[PDB]
C-alpha cells in the first residue's frame, strides 16, 4: 500500500506553515 500524493501540490492554503516544520518535530505541530 503506502499511498502518497503524486502531484506537485496537495493543498493551497491548508495546514498553514505546519508542513514546513522539520520531520523530527512534526509531532509537535498540527494542521
Amino acid at each position: 500500500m503506502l499511498d502518497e500524493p503524486l502531484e506537485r501540490t496537495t493543498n493551497s492554503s491548508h495546514a498553514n506553515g505546519a508542513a514546513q516544520a522539520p520531520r523530527s518535530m512534526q509531532w509537535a505541530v498540527r494542521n
Binding site: 502518497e4 500524493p5 503524486l6 502531484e7 506537485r8
Partner: protein, 111 residues
C-alpha cells in the same frame, strides 16, 4: 543526489494520448515505481535527459521552467525525447511495461 520524493514534489503531468483516468492513474504509479527503481548513475542520467542538470536544485525557486511530462500517443518503437529549454519530458504511452522500462533505460543511457 536526486530523491524520488523531491522529484514528485514539483513534477506536473500532461495528457496528449487521450487515455482514461483509471488507466492514467495506474500509469503514473508505474512511472513513479520505475523512477524509484534504479541506482544513482541511472537517476543522474534521467535528470540529465530531463533538465540537462545532473543534480536537482534544492529549492523550487530557481527553476526557470516548471518540469512537466507529456504523454505522446502510444508508439512502442519510438524512444522518448525531452525539451531542455523548458525541461519537458515527451514520453509515449507504453501500455506494455517491460518495453517502457527498456526504452526509458535506453533513452537515458545516451549521453
Amino acid at each position: 543526489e536526486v530523491n524520488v520524493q523531491m522529484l514528485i514534489s514539483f513534477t506536473s503531468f500532461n495528457d496528449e494520448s487521450g487515455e482514461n483516468a483509471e488507466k492514467l492513474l495506474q500509469f503514473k504509479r508505474w512511472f513513479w515505481s520505475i523512477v524509484e527503481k534504479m541506482s544513482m548513475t541511472e537517476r543522474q542520467d534521467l535528470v540529465y535527459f530531463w533538465t540537462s542538470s545532473p543534480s536537482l536544485p534544492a529549492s523550487e525557486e530557481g527553476f526557470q521552467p516548471m518540469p512537466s511530462i507529456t504523454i505522446r500517443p502510444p508508439d512502442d518503437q519510438h524512444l522518448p525525447t525531452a525539451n531542455t529549454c523548458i525541461s519537458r519530458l515527451y514520453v509515449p504511452l507504453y501500455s506494455s511495461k517491460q518495453i517502457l522500462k527498456q526504452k526509458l533505460l535506453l533513452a537515458i543511457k545516451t549521453k
